[PDB]
Amino acid sequence: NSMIGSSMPLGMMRIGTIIHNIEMNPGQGAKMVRAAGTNAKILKEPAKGKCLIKLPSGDTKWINAKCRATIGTVSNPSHGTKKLYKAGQSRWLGIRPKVRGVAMNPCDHPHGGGEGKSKSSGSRGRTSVSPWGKPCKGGYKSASVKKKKKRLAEA
Amino acid sequence: RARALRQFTLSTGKSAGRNSSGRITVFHRGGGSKRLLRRIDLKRSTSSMGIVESIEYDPNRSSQIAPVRWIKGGCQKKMNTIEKFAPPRKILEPTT
Amino acid sequence: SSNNPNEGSVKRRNAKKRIG
RNA sequence: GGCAAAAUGACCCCGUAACUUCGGGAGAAGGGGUGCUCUCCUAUCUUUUGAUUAGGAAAGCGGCACAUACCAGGGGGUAGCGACUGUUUAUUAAAAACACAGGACUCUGCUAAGUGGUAACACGAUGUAUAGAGUCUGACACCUGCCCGGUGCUGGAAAGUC
RNA sequence: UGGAGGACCGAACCCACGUAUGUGGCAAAAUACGGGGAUGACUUGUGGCUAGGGGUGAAAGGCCAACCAAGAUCGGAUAUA
């Protein structure tokens, strides 16, 4: 009897199930997967406090057994599918119009300038860069690779 | 629904990407529609059971939210559980 | 399932008054 | 450079093309009618007494002229750019510039990434990958070839070099 | 029967497209006649916030008290040339 909407610690949870609304620290409060209809999935139960979970990001983590979850995927699966159809919809949600790089005068974004469209060089030009010299394509992480690799190689 | 449940409404003002010092921090947002905040019990309760009373459209977190009239613990209605998918009115157990 | 038990509680005094 | 000026305009009726995303083009284009008088019937109207006001029949009657003054769309055919409504150089440029929903890539497992500061800390967000940030393009349809040698970005091996 | 539209025509309103006027003018940016949108990415009143290498920007090097490729005013300072 694993029934939908119910919660419990993972210690009373069986392998292969589907879950959402996990909490990272023991009882802190559900901060893991929460969005409209997105489902994690457990992978095993070694009785060492930890439980290996596969998250929607594809990657996986270990959560203490005394932590909790909610059976079944979150509600409302379509929201990730509904395509808006004008500008007013964004505006209502809260957005404002976002301006690109190659538009701004060079004084304002590293991609500026040009007499007509252009951004960077054929030798010099580094890549496409954020407003603060940080590059955004290629797999860039900016020395948070330290944190990533530490928490990974804890496996 | 006309209003939310009076126990759970709370109006935190917007912040169009400004920190505690009123400069622009996260660009491109602000200007939308006045929301409220529905205080959700995001850390489950002590062992009990409840009956889903309704399902309400929720502006903040995409999913819908379900006030559950509780039969145990004297809760007599908590704001909800982030909406479980399958059952639209059924019975829950937060812990065995 | 009521969302508002009201009573002999009144509203919009300083709106009515202004209309008058 | 038909700039300006002119002209068309209203209501009712007749009829209305290419094209198509089959929603539209479309007030498409192209025409007719418009006054008052009495009578008849119709409706309608309690503002009582039966007539009055409007519509539509049909017979006159006058004027060159009957939305008579004021008010009030020029239209059609075909390229380019942009999909469009929008926004911008207050105070010489309103556009083909910008945005725009739509698309892809990259980053983030939550003390989230990223941002401001020295720093607490705040935004992110009482949000949790159907999420948030950045980047390029810009509805739709058809589609998106080759090259990683250069610049960058990146994974990684023991060697030497530190 | 219904009454949706970043729907349509058009005053309030805002905005500022063309011509002509004016060019110590009526005015250190207006007027006349025509123009565009006109339930929305709307217009506005009130009050609060962001402050100079900074703000803010549907991005024009635009705007920040009538003159912004780094405001105004004091001061270094009778800067230098």
Side-chain angles (χ1 to χ4, degrees), chain A residues 40-143:
Chain A
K41 175 175 168 62
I42 312 165
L43 286 189
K44 62 191 72 175
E45 165 37 56
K48 47 188 198 59
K50 309 306 200 326
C51 298
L52 178 87
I53 323 296
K54 163 180 217 55
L55 292 193
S57 296
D59 54 357
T60 181
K61 265 199 96 155
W62 296 76
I63 314 297
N64 173 29
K66 314 296 181 57
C67 279
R68 287 167 159 274
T70 46
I71 311 298
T73 169
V74 195
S75 69
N76 187 31
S78 83
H79 157 62
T81 70
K82 295 314 286 278
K83 283 205 260 205
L84 317 156
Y85 63 98
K86 59 182 200 158
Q89 298 174 275
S90 54
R91 288 312 268 266
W92 301 347
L93 263 296
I95 309 306
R96 291 192 72 257
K98 318 185 256 303
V99 187
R100 287 159 29 256
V102 196
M104 297 173 176
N105 286 98
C107 175
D108 300 13
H109 197 273
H111 277 183
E115 58 293 10
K117 329 210 174 192
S118 173
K119 57 190 73 64
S120 280
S121 179
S123 156
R124 312 205 177 112
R126 323 279 202 189
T127 316
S128 279
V129 299
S130 60
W132 304 278
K134 299 284 174 286
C136 45
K137 315 211 187 179
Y140 183 85
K141 292 166 186 294
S142 90

Side-chain angles (χ1 to χ4, degrees), chain C residues 1-9 11-14 16 18-20:
Chain C
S1 73
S2 280
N3 317 116
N4 277 323
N6 294 328
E7 284 172 326
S9 86
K11 295 174 34 184
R12 279 315 99 174
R13 278 81 64 84
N14 217 328
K16 301 175 52 168
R18 195 171 312 120
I19 309 148

Side-chain angles (χ1 to χ4, degrees), chain B residues 19-91:
Chain B
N19 52 13
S20 176
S21 44
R23 324 165 50 86
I24 281 186
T25 286
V26 163
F27 302 73
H28 315 332
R29 39 205 299 196
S33 308
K34 177 53 177 181
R35 300 209 186 91
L36 291 190
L37 271 303
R38 306 187 163 64
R39 161 187 146 69
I40 291 182
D41 189 344
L42 285 164
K43 46 179 79 75
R44 267 313 173 77
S45 44
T46 41
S47 314
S48 64
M49 286 168 69
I51 283 87
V52 180
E53 204 276 345
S54 301
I55 311 171
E56 292 140 353
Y57 167 86
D58 184 13
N60 306 303
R61 38 178 77 72
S62 60
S63 64
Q64 320 197 17
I65 45 176
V68 181
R69 161 167 89 178
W70 297 90
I71 288 311
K72 306 174 182 177
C75 302
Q76 186 173 355
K77 254 169 290 181
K78 279 306 157 54
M79 179 67 181
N80 55 79
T81 59
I82 284 37
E83 207 209 335
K84 58 202 184 308
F85 185 35
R89 293 182 183 174
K90 287 274 184 180
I91 302 193

